[PDB]
Amino acid sequence: PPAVPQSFQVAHLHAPTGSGKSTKVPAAYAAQGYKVLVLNPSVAATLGFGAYMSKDPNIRTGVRTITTGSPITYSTYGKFLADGGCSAYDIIICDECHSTDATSILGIGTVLDQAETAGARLVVLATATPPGSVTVSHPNIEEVALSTTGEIPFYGKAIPLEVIKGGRHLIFCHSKKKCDELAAKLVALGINAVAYYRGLDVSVIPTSGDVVVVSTDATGDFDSVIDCNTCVTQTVDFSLDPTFTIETTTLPQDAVSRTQRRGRTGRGKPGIYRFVAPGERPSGMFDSSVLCECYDAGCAWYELTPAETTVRLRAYMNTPGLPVCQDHLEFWEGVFTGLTHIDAHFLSQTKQSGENFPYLVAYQATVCARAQAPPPSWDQMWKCLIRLKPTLHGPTPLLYRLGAVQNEVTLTHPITKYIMTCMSADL
Numbered sequence: 001p002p003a004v005p006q007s008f009q010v011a012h013l014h015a016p017t018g019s020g021k022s023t024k025v026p027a028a029y030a031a032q033g034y035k036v037l038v039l040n041p042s043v044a045a046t047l048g049f050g051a052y053m054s055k056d057p058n059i060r061t062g063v064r065t066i067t068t069g070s071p072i073t074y075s076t077y078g079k080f081l082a083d084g085g086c087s088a089y090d091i092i093i094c095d096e097c098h099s100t101d102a103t104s105i106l107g108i109g110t111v112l113d114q115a116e117t118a119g120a121r122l123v124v125l126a127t128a129t130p131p132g133s134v135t136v137s138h139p140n141i142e143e144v145a146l147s148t149t150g151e152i153p154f155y156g157k158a159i160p161l162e163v164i165k166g167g168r169h170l171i172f173c174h175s176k177k178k179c180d181e182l183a184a185k186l187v188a189l190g191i192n193a194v195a196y197y198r199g200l201d202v203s204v205i206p207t208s209g210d211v212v213v214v215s216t217d218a219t220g221d222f223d224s225v226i227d228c229n230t231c232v233t234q235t236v237d238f239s240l241d242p243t244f245t246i247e248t249t250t251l252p253q254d255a256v257s258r259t260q261r262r263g264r265t266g267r268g269k270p271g272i273y274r275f276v277a278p279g280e281r282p283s284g285m286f287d288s289s290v291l292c293e294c295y296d297a298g299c300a301w302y303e304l305t306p307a308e309t310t311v312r313l314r315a316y317m318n319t320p321g322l323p324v325c326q327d328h329l330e331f332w333e334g335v336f337t338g339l340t341h342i343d344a345h346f347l348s349q350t351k352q353s354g355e356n357f358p359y360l361v362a363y364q365a366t367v368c369a370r371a372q373a374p375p376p377s378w379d380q381m382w383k384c385l386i387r388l389k390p391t392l393h394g395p396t397p398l399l400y401r402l403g404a405v406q407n408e409v410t411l412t413h414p415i416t417k418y419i420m421t422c423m424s425a426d427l
């Protein structure tokens with residue numbers, strides 16, 4: 001238990017997930033008379049530690065807020081951001097501080113930039129999977145390499161039928177077209193194959209007997225888990241056509257990713273993990289398009305100027321022991337700064353709808369509406385514009401590229417031109 005210091009310290013705390021760090025740790029600090037805040041990315045986790053310690057801490061999530069007068073608060077990073085960040089606490093624990101979702105990143109950076117001014121003595125950056133870590137072996141999971149033999153084609157290797165006859169098995173595949181293709185062949189060999197991915201109702205998975213569930217990362221109880229060892233990963237490309245493209249890329253998975261997928265077996269009883277590849281990237285590198293996400297979340301959810309968002313991301317990049325990324329702070333701040341007078345109605349629909357880049361989407365929707373032009377495609381991304389579809393004609397004033405573009409485009413909008421400058425100035 002890192003002692004509370006005389007001057008402000010940032011501390012790192014690497015210890016297994018579940019053991020001590022969101023639970024025993026804060027309680028020991030409180031037992032010494034300190035005020036302590038414990039930050040977590042997930043709502044369920046924050047309530048999970050709340051309930052478990054209530055046998056009483058303050059609990060601060062978007063959906064539920066309990067104030068109890070306790071010296072211990074469990075918040076998510078998002079609610080922490082919503083509450084204006086640093087008010088009130090001697091000690092702030094950033095739990096699961098490896099997390100590369102926007103919110104967590106803005107959260108920690110916020111804690112890093114502000115904790116000292118606001119009078120804290122200690123910030124503990126806690127996680128069980130700090131940068132460079134690999135997958136540790138699990139007592140309940142036997143791990144067996146797949147070999148070229150077997151009669152089912154699987155990412156260069158093969159799977160034997162014997163391993164997926166009898167019981168429950170989960171096969172992780174990388175995309176959607178690949179889940180369909182694989183489920184289908186198993187149905188054509190008797191086996192009970194069920195594909196799952198974003199845009200399916202969770203009902204379609206049987207609950208009791210034999211199945212081979214072919215899903216992405218979109219109770220389960222599996223006897224076996226089968227992993228293609230790859231992940232579709234969001235990335236940015238500065239393609240100058242006219243500006244940037246948000247697209248995907250399939251990289252070999254990292255440690256936490258291998259963990260997450262292996263952990264779908266061994267749920268108490270024994271488990272089996274069979275792999276396409278023996279290796280893994282180490283964790284601790286994230287794409288530029290995560291920076292774009294921070295500026296997006298900041299502008300859409302957290303009422304931050306681009307500039308404030310930068311101040312918080314700077315603190316995060318000025319701390320050692322954290323996921324590292326390209327320094328595109330001035331670029332990304334530049335971009336969002338030009339993005340003014342969004343339609344609040346469009347913004348509100350792309351937020352509700354769980355869109356990625358809800359701000360950039362609603363902004364391209366805004367620009368489209370005011371021009372009376374259509375969006376770059378009639379995909380699901382552009383749902384907010386359906387009400388107006390009947391009124392919209394001509395070429396799409398294209399700002400950036402978030403997906404497929406079916407409509408002809410104009411490249412001359414002031415916002416398009418402005419962004420273009422940003423990339424020639426800051427890149």
Ligand SMILES: CC(C)c1ccc(Cn2cc(CC(=O)O)c3ccc(-c4cc(N)cc(N)c4)cc32)cc1
Nearest residue numbers: 043060061062063076078079082103297301302354
């Ligand atoms: C998963 C991804 C698509 C996503 C979803 C949602 C958000 C925003 N967000 C995520 C969390 C975490 C939690 O639920 O505790 C959260 C909490 C409180 C607020 C909030 C509350 C008020 N009263 C005003 C404002 N402005 C914000 C927004 C939040 C960010 C990212």
